[model samples]
Target chain A: GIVEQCCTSICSLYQLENYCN
Target chain B: FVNQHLCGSHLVEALYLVCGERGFFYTPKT
Candidate 1:
């Protein structure tokens, strides 16, 4: 759920891309 | 889990294209 957490939290879209990897 | 991961990966790709097209690299400048 890292991406999910990213979607809801303060993570930038840039950071979210890392989770996709 | 596989399906969800696929969704996230695809989403990231899509978003990346959009952001990249707009010059929103967001990466730290060297």
Candidate 2:
């Protein structure tokens, strides 16, 4: 499930950065 | 006796080539 975890992490980071900016 | 399978596999393929060129002092390159 590492791939799923990585995908989820990247997605959350992307959303966080997108919303923060 | 048991029933289980904890294995995986991967496949990878690649290609590389070279060419020639005109020169006078024989420019050796890769």
Candidate 3:
């Protein structure tokens, strides 16, 4: 899933707050 | 604001050591 490609993020910095929490 | 550069996928991190050349990567526009 997340282990097959290169991207700046799963979504974006604006939404990354959810990832950190 | 706090900032960081773009990060690569976990696959890149895990397989880059040995299989970096195995796949072709691209960003598509639709």
Candidate 4:
């Protein structure tokens, strides 16, 4: 068995939140 | 810590490849 799922939709972004300190 | 950001998750280990995917959207500390 083999299953390798990486974001192929042009790699949508993920950045939790912001930092303004 | 602001260094461990994980939201839309993705963590895998297909025996070796050691998958990854963690789309994010979270901030809780108020």
Candidate 5:
């Protein structure tokens, strides 16, 4: 099985923080 | 993903992709 993740469109810093957290 | 950067990496699906885009450097895993 495969899972998908979606994130808000933003800068590298914001996206990295969101996923990193 | 930034609008200008959306040329790629947007809605990207990876069988497997690794990233090292860390704001700060960290070494050693405890």
Candidate 6:
């Protein structure tokens, strides 16, 4: 299974899309 | 807030790249 952690380094790198104002 | 020391050069670079040159909402004095 692929665990996708949003706050982790690489995940944050991508999810940085929505985190900022 | 200033001087919070939340990030280093690389992490800061990432935010700057993704979030534009503004970086994080919190301002840190160099």
Model 1 per-residue lDDT tens digits across residues A1-21: 544554344344554455332
Question: Which residue pairs overlap in candidate 3's backbone?
Answer: A3-B11
Best by TM-score: 6
lDDT of 6 by residue, A1-21 (tens): 001232232335454435446
Candidate 2 chain B lowest-lDDT run of ten: B10-19
By lDDT, the candidates rank as: 1, 6, 3, 5, 4, 2
**How does the DockQ of candidate 2 come out?**
0.03
Question: Model 2, chain B: what is the TM-score?
Answer: 0.16
- lDDT of candidate 5 over B1-30, digit per residue (tens): 432122134423211122334332222123
Instruction: State the lDDT of candidate 4 residue by residue for B1-30, as single tens digits.
Output: 222212223412221122124332223334
Which structure is stronger by DockQ: 1 or 4? Answer: 1
Error of 2 at B23 (Å): 41
Error of 4 at B8 (Å): 18
* Prediction 6 global C-alpha lDDT: 0.41
Q: Per-residue lDDT of B1-30 in model 2, one digit per residue for the tens?
A: 222221121100000001112111211122
Q: Tell me, by lDDT, which candidate is best.
A: 1
Per-residue accuracy of model 3 over B1-30 as CA lDDT, tens digit each: 333234445433333433345543332333
RMSD vs true structure, all candidates: 9.4, 20.3, 10.6, 13.5, 10.3, 11.5
TM-score of chain A of 6: 0.16
Give the local distance difference test score of model 1: 0.43
Off by over 4 Å in 2: A10-21, B1-30
Q: Which candidate number would show the highest DockQ if scored against the true structure?
A: 3
For candidate 1, give the DockQ.
0.11
Q: Is candidate 4 or candidate 5 better by DockQ?
A: 5
lDDT of 3 by residue, A1-21 (tens): 222212434433333332221
